[PDB]
């Protein structure tokens, strides 16, 4: 986007001042749409000395004479050329600027336009800038941020000491990663993406994206009328143990509910019986184990079951011990089918195995599992999209790193999912998603496409829950999947 601006100015020939005018008027129109008629309100515009403040001067100038009151507090020590030109127009148009901020100033205004820092923020905010941002955050006024709430790092979504909490953020051309990852996503409030005149070709060239309704609609597999269960593929789910007898059921129904033709589970006896007592449409094959866990003695039987399926999901509820580790790694080394690898299969995984595999794989860790897998702290991997890109690329896989914003990447293309709510922050919700993914692969979507569609729908199903989100359980999520599909078309 730095790149996009520069090319639009220097190669396409659009005056920087035209882009700036277009930015500012977008903010005015975005505010009107959100607040209704503006003429009743008093506006306090806070401008830094870079181009973010320049956009703010455009805003302020365009409100002169049309609203109850405008005042600009200019907080910078010097001005970029466009900021200066715009500051000049604001004053020629009769605008009032002050350079000193007093805490009672907020008392006489209804809306704060935050044009202090955008993408040019570097390092922590301290000193007056910070005292001002804290005052705004305590004031309870309506806050509108230009481009990015000041203090959010636009490439990571991290808070650089302190940051503005906005009701509305107006961003230019494309969402920034910092609007999509948390905490930034939270401080952004309602986000509007304004077209300010960049050539559409450049806007489209952007290689990291938000998964949208339209993109999911066009990836959903076709349901031709003349079809049968084989049309829609076969999944095998290798899951469960004497400790975790429910996980397999959640994964199997996840596959069935997204439209898979036939789902079989391989679960240790007698735990396999639990699945068909709840959902008799599932096939649940009993595996004779020694101690209640899968081990090498089960390798041959599971490779046999694998011949008649299109995809195998493995890991939910397996347990994390030596015999499971030996089994999971020998199985995956020999399986010549697409594999969806979750949960305890990730906790015991030898990543050398992924490299030597010809068939594709999707891994679906949460950050605690990802942390253990690559030997880093949870805080080093969380929202770390470059680490995820590098891991996918090195291991030839699709990585689905689950969190409130989920990252889906194969190393070349990275997508961000923002559907969902905290009802998914509960055990079982991941086991459902694993089956969804396996299911869409069985129906013929690629591993990356299956993952894209599944995280969206899984999040959207949670949002359709009728009661308070915290009471949402995995079983109820399963029941909402087909409504999410219907609403998606």
């Amino acid at each position: 986007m730095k790149e996009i601006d520069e090319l639009t100015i220097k190669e396409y020939g659009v005056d920087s001042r035209i882009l700036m005018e277009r930015a500012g008027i977008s903010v005015v129109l975005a505010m009107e749409e959100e607040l209704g008629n503006l003429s009743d309100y008093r506006f306090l515009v806070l401008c830094g000395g870079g181009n973010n403040g320049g956009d703010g001067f455009v805003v302020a100038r365009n409100l002169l004479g049309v609203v109850k009151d405008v005042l600009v507090v200019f907080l910078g020590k010097k001005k970029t050329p466009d900021c200066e030109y715009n500051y000049g127009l604001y004053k020629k148009f009769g605008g009032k600027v002050v350079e000193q901020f007093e805490p009672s100033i907020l008392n006489e205004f209804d809306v704060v336009v935050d044009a202090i820092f955008g993408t040019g923020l570097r390092g922590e905010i301290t000193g007056e800038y910070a005292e001002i941002i804290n005052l705004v955050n305590k004031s309870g006024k309506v806050v509108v941020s230009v481009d990015v709430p000041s203090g959010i790092d636009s490439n990571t979504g991290k808070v650089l000491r302190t940051a503005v909490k906005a009701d509305l953020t107006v961003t230019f051309g494309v969402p920034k990663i910092g609007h999509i990852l948390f905490p930034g996503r939270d401080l952004t409030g309602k986000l509007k993406v304004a077209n300010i005149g960049h050539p559409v070709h450049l806007i489209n060239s952007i290689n990291r994206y938000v998964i949208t309704r339209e993109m999911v609609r066009s990836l959903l597999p076709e349901r031709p009328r003349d079809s049968h269960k084989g049309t829609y593929g076969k999944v095998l789910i290798i899951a469960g143990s004497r400790l975790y007898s429910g996980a397999p059921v959640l994964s199997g129904m996840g596959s069935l509910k997204v439209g898979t033709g036939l789902v079989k589970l391989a679960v240790p006896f007698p735990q396999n019986l639990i699945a068909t007592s709840r959902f008799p449409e599932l096939i649940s094959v009993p595996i004779d184990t020694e101690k209640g866990f899968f081990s090498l003695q089960n390798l041959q039987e599971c490779l046999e079951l694998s011949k008649d399926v299109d995809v195998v999901a493995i890991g939910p509820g397996l347990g994390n011990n030596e015999h499971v580790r030996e089994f999971v790694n020998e199985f995956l080394k020999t399986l010549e089918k697409p594999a969806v690898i979750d949960a305890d299969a990730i906790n015991v995984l030898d990543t050398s195995v992924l490299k030597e595999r010809k068939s594709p794989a999707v891994l679906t860790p949460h950050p605690g599992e990802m942390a253990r897998l690559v030997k880093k702290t949870v805080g080093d991997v969380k929202y770390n999209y470059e680490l995820a890109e590098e891991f996918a690329k090195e291991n030839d896989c699709v990585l689905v790193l689950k969190s409130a914003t989920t990252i889906v990447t194969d190393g070349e293309k990275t997508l961000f999912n923002i559907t969902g709510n905290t009802g998914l922050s509960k055990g079982g919700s991941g086991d459902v998603l694993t089956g969804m993914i396996a299911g869409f692969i069985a129906q013929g979507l690629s591993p990356l496409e299956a993952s894209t569609v599944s995280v969206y729908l899984h999040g959207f199903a949670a949002e359709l829950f009728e009661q308070d989100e915290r009471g949402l359980t995995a079983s109820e999520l399963l029941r909402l999947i087909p409504e999410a599909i219907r609403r998606l078309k």
Binding site: V28, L29, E32, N37, L38, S39, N62, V66
Partner: peptide
């Protein structure tokens, strides 16, 4: 009404 009068 900021952009248009009718």
């Amino acid at each position: 009404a900021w952009l248009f009068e009718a």
